[PDB]
Scaffold this active site. Structure first.
Site, PDB file in Angstrom:
ATOM      1  N   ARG A 227      28.084  45.621   8.692  1.00  0.00           N
ATOM      2  CA  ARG A 227      28.890  46.410   9.739  1.00  0.00           C
ATOM      3  C   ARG A 227      27.930  46.946  10.757  1.00  0.00           C
ATOM      4  O   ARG A 227      27.132  47.592   9.994  1.00  0.00           O
ATOM      5  CB  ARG A 227      30.114  47.105   9.175  1.00  0.00           C
ATOM      6  CG  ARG A 227      31.269  46.173   8.610  1.00  0.00           C
ATOM      7  CD  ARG A 227      31.771  45.501   9.782  1.00  0.00           C
ATOM      8  NE  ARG A 227      33.299  44.726   9.396  1.00  0.00           N
ATOM      9  CZ  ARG A 227      33.039  43.321   9.226  1.00  0.00           C
ATOM     10  NH1 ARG A 227      31.991  42.659   9.316  1.00  0.00           N
ATOM     11  NH2 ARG A 227      34.338  42.729   9.204  1.00  0.00           N
ATOM     12  N   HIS A 275      26.850  38.655  15.938  1.00  0.00           N
ATOM     13  CA  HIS A 275      27.855  38.733  14.954  1.00  0.00           C
ATOM     14  C   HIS A 275      28.342  37.179  14.389  1.00  0.00           C
ATOM     15  O   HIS A 275      29.512  36.946  14.417  1.00  0.00           O
ATOM     16  CB  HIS A 275      29.259  39.520  15.279  1.00  0.00           C
ATOM     17  CG  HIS A 275      29.895  39.852  14.099  1.00  0.00           C
ATOM     18  ND1 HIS A 275      30.743  41.033  14.288  1.00  0.00           N
ATOM     19  CD2 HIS A 275      29.946  39.177  12.808  1.00  0.00           C
ATOM     20  CE1 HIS A 275      31.453  41.214  13.034  1.00  0.00           C
ATOM     21  NE2 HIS A 275      31.044  40.333  12.092  1.00  0.00           N
TER      22      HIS A 275
HETATM   23  N1  LIG Z   1      29.455  37.804  10.197  1.00  0.00           N
HETATM   24  C1  LIG Z   1      29.123  38.720   9.259  1.00  0.00           C
HETATM   25  O1  LIG Z   1      28.184  39.778   9.505  1.00  0.00           O
HETATM   26  C2  LIG Z   1      29.952  39.236   7.929  1.00  0.00           C
HETATM   27  C3  LIG Z   1      30.838  37.950   7.352  1.00  0.00           C
HETATM   28  C4  LIG Z   1      31.613  38.262   6.389  1.00  0.00           C
HETATM   29  C5  LIG Z   1      31.355  39.428   5.723  1.00  0.00           C
HETATM   30  N2  LIG Z   1      30.609  40.552   6.333  1.00  0.00           N
HETATM   31  C6  LIG Z   1      30.487  41.923   5.737  1.00  0.00           C
HETATM   32  O2  LIG Z   1      29.967  41.811   4.288  1.00  0.00           O
HETATM   33  C7  LIG Z   1      30.793  42.823   3.501  1.00  0.00           C
HETATM   34  C8  LIG Z   1      30.852  42.357   2.191  1.00  0.00           C
HETATM   35  O3  LIG Z   1      31.512  41.157   1.651  1.00  0.00           O
HETATM   36  P1  LIG Z   1      31.830  40.876   0.117  1.00  0.00           P
HETATM   37  O4  LIG Z   1      32.798  39.774  -0.020  1.00  0.00           O
HETATM   38  O5  LIG Z   1      30.391  41.040  -0.499  1.00  0.00           O
HETATM   39  O6  LIG Z   1      32.353  42.523  -0.270  1.00  0.00           O
HETATM   40  P2  LIG Z   1      32.884  42.865  -1.869  1.00  0.00           P
HETATM   41  O7  LIG Z   1      32.765  41.733  -2.511  1.00  0.00           O
HETATM   42  O8  LIG Z   1      33.795  43.744  -1.504  1.00  0.00           O
HETATM   43  O9  LIG Z   1      31.376  43.783  -2.190  1.00  0.00           O
HETATM   44  C9  LIG Z   1      31.213  44.871  -1.561  1.00  0.00           C
HETATM   45  C10 LIG Z   1      30.255  45.465  -2.495  1.00  0.00           C
HETATM   46  O10 LIG Z   1      30.056  46.965  -1.779  1.00  0.00           O
HETATM   47  C11 LIG Z   1      29.959  47.875  -2.673  1.00  0.00           C
HETATM   48  N3  LIG Z   1      30.404  49.239  -2.281  1.00  0.00           N
HETATM   49  C12 LIG Z   1      31.440  49.507  -1.759  1.00  0.00           C
HETATM   50  N4  LIG Z   1      31.353  50.817  -1.500  1.00  0.00           N
HETATM   51  C13 LIG Z   1      30.378  51.676  -1.935  1.00  0.00           C
HETATM   52  C14 LIG Z   1      29.976  52.722  -1.899  1.00  0.00           C
HETATM   53  N5  LIG Z   1      30.645  53.917  -1.415  1.00  0.00           N
HETATM   54  N6  LIG Z   1      28.496  53.077  -2.668  1.00  0.00           N
HETATM   55  C15 LIG Z   1      28.069  51.910  -3.098  1.00  0.00           C
HETATM   56  N7  LIG Z   1      28.579  50.615  -3.003  1.00  0.00           N
HETATM   57  C16 LIG Z   1      29.593  50.306  -2.525  1.00  0.00           C
HETATM   58  C17 LIG Z   1      30.709  47.508  -3.930  1.00  0.00           C
HETATM   59  O11 LIG Z   1      30.425  48.243  -4.992  1.00  0.00           O
HETATM   60  P3  LIG Z   1      31.194  47.559  -6.628  1.00  0.00           P
HETATM   61  O12 LIG Z   1      30.730  46.225  -6.969  1.00  0.00           O
HETATM   62  O13 LIG Z   1      30.738  48.730  -7.441  1.00  0.00           O
HETATM   63  O14 LIG Z   1      32.643  47.721  -6.079  1.00  0.00           O
HETATM   64  C18 LIG Z   1      30.707  46.027  -3.913  1.00  0.00           C
HETATM   65  O15 LIG Z   1      29.375  45.567  -4.648  1.00  0.00           O
HETATM   66  C19 LIG Z   1      32.304  42.875   4.139  1.00  0.00           C
HETATM   67  O16 LIG Z   1      32.694  44.171   3.849  1.00  0.00           O
HETATM   68  C20 LIG Z   1      31.832  42.514   5.550  1.00  0.00           C
HETATM   69  O17 LIG Z   1      31.653  43.932   6.283  1.00  0.00           O
HETATM   70  C21 LIG Z   1      30.037  40.369   7.558  1.00  0.00           C
END
Ligand SMILES: NC(=O)c1ccc[n+]([C@@H]2O[C@H](COP(=O)([O-])OP(=O)(O)OC[C@H]3O[C@@H](n4cnc5c(N)ncnc54)[C@H](OP(=O)(O)O)[C@@H]3O)[C@@H](O)[C@H]2O)c1
Ligand SMILES: NC(=O)c1ccc[n+]([C@@H]2O[C@H](COP(=O)([O-])OP(=O)(O)OC[C@H]3O[C@@H](n4cnc5c(N)ncnc54)[C@H](OP(=O)(O)O)[C@@H]3O)[C@@H](O)[C@H]2O)c1
EC number: 1.1.1.79
Lengths: 310, 310
Positions: A227, A275
């Site tokens: 993000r 993006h």
């Molecule tokens: N086109 C693009 O750029 C695109 C596309 C898709 C997604 N994304 C981005 O990628 C993100 C991740 O997707 P995902 O499916 O991997 O999400 P996810 O499975 O929910 O993984 C989120 C990770 O971030 C960690 N986290 C959350 N809050 C935190 C904090 N305060 N301190 C440390 N770690 C923290 C979590 O730790 P825990 O494992 O301990 O819970 C988890 O490991 C989305 O939120 C989105 O913003 C971007």
């Protein structure tokens, strides 16, 4: 069952017909304003309040990996989604591989100094450069989730040293797991490459600022795949200008489309994609949604934590 | 045993000391002009005639993957290496992985349209572009040898359709094998990406010319990792200018360093690296050479075919 579908720009009729084939007992319709007929499941991207308000749904499926938008809308409009309604997001559905493609390509690009050779090519200047070594190229993944783990897995294939940061400890055999704000400084100290795959939450906004960047090794690289709010753009630019950061590839930004006045566009060490790092693959999303509804119906294991924020 | 070593630019004392540790019964020395003392093995890169002429060696180890230089020198100076002397080259010794790094990074770069996004970034212009699909991105590997097979293996990981071309049929389960000049046109017809890993021989000089390029699909990409003589540079430039070829990344050239007057340097769809795609990793080369000598001594399976030319 009855399914209502809303997406502001996707091929709606395509999705309706695929959902009908995957769930042949379901009546699927596109939601328009004024439709207060009954529905069991809602599939949504940036839904208006009226689509969900007052509805005792069996589940809502947000058609994206990120959920910072819908969760912020639910906080501004507590009447929009009853707490009784479970909220699901798209986990992988093809975005795992897309993040791997992006990260592996660009990590290798930097490791093999294609950025330096491009600069030299601009002057028609031929000069072999010293090789970089894996031991100096530890890759740290901020966020160790669905996408973080896929990116870590693909880079381990190339034998880069690997570390990850999250809230809870991870068990990936060859990846050093750092957890909590209290371990973030140690995590950062060795990250030659820093890959951001965090969700947007109040706790992570602005986390890539001047104090974080200064703890990285000199000549570090930043890959922001998550993000735009995670990066203080003026702090990144100062670290690029001082040589702290050698290169940054950014897919997301605080304002999108990135305004043309931003110094990031023309900065020589910045690479911009609009993006597009990972997009939902419709057929995989339909398979995931159809499978999840079947498991819900059968009472099997399967979801967004609204209190937690992601 | 006695080993003589010659390399015109490597850290010679480093190699001598590593060879002595790996082969503790061996007396290793750097060859200088005038040294006609006895030797059992010679390790060479661009050796002068006098180093090998008249010597009844047990083996010569050329310190590179390519052998077009030494073989052409042996043809101009038949007295240089007796036909009784077996000639070995370096197979992989780390160059496999280096070719994989280069090819995977750049194939993914093109597949994800980072070249188009860079052009758009130059004008501070934000525009998501349509996704490319694997079915339209068949990758063809010209040359299916030690390095070709490693590059094919790493790209199969990413689920690209794959085909290879060589003299003899290959058996790689997921890779369509084309063989001989009589099958080259069919091979080329589907190659969205063409990766060159051929040796320089009389049979392959100039093979990437106008007739070859015209048989590729429109919007093809060329990755020349092998030898500069394989490409008719003016023919490549015409195919780039006409849109037949969308991009070319070149590590090697007919004249090296590439003269600054070449239009390849400033051409917008060309990326240049200064012959650095894969370099010998000294410790792996020493391990391979030490192991080969031990196998020769034990009469075990282990080599360059001078008649064949590679
Ligand atoms: N086109 C693009 O750029 C695109 C596309 C898709 C997604 N994304 C981005 O990628 C993100 C991740 O997707 P995902 O499916 O991997 O999400 P996810 O499975 O929910 O993984 C989120 C990770 O971030 C960690 N986290 C959350 N809050 C935190 C904090 N305060 N301190 C440390 N770690 C923290 C979590 O730790 P825990 O494992 O301990 O819970 C988890 O490991 C989305 O939120 C989105 O913003 C971007
Ligand atoms: N930095 C650099 O750019 C760099 C570094 C190292 C090597 N290289 C280049 O890469 C080359 C390949 O190395 P390698 O170890 O993979 O060589 P290799 O194991 O000898 O493989 C050569 C392949 O080319 C094929 N071939 C030879 N002549 C042919 C012809 N007339 N028609 C069709 N196919 C033909 C062979 O087919 P068969 O399998 O039927 O025999 C074989 O598959 C070297 O010659 C060198 O030029 C470049």
């Amino acid at each position: 069952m009855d399914i209502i579908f809303y997406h502001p720009t996707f091929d709606t009729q395509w999705w309706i017909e695929a959902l009908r084939k995957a769930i042949p007992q379901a009546r699927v319709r596109a939601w328009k304003s004024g439709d207060n007929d009954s529905a069991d499941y809602a599939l949504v991207f940036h839904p208006p309040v009226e689509m969900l308000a007052g509805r005792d749904l069996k589940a809502v499926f947000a058609l994206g990996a990120g959920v910072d938008s819908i969760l912020s809308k639910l906080q501004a409009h507590p009447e929009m989604l009853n707490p009784s309604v479970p909220l699901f997001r798209l986990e992988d559905t093809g975005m795992g591989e897309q993040m791997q493609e992006y990260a592996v390509s660009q990590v290798l690009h930097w490791f093999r100094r294609f950025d330096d050779y491009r600069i030299q090519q601009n002057s028609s200047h031929w000069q072999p450069l010293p090789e970089y070594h894996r031991e100096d190229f530890t890759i740290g993944i901020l966020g160790a989730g669905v996408l973080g783990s896929k990116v870590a897995q693909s880079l381990q294939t190339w034998r880069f040293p690997l570390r990850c940061w999250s809230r809870t400890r991870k068990s990936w055999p060859g990846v050093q797991s750092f957890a909590g704000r209290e371990e973030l400084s140690a995590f950062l100290s060795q990250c030659r490459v820093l890959i951001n795959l965090l969700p947007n939450t109040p706790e992570t906004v602005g986390i890539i600022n001047q104090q974080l960047l200064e703890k990285l090794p000199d000549g570090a690289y930043l890959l922001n795949l998550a993000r735009g709010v995670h990066v203080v753009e003026d702090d990144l630019l100062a670290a690029l200008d001082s040589g702290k950061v050698k290169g940054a590839m950014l897919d997301v930004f605080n304002r999108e489309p990135l305004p043309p006045e931003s110094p990031l566009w023309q900065h020589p060490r910045v690479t911009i994609t609009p993006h597009v790092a990972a997009i939902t693959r419709p057929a995989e999303a339909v398979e995931y949604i159809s499978r999840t509804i079947a498991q819900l119906e059968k009472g099997e294991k399967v979801q967004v934590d609204r209190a937690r924020g992601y």
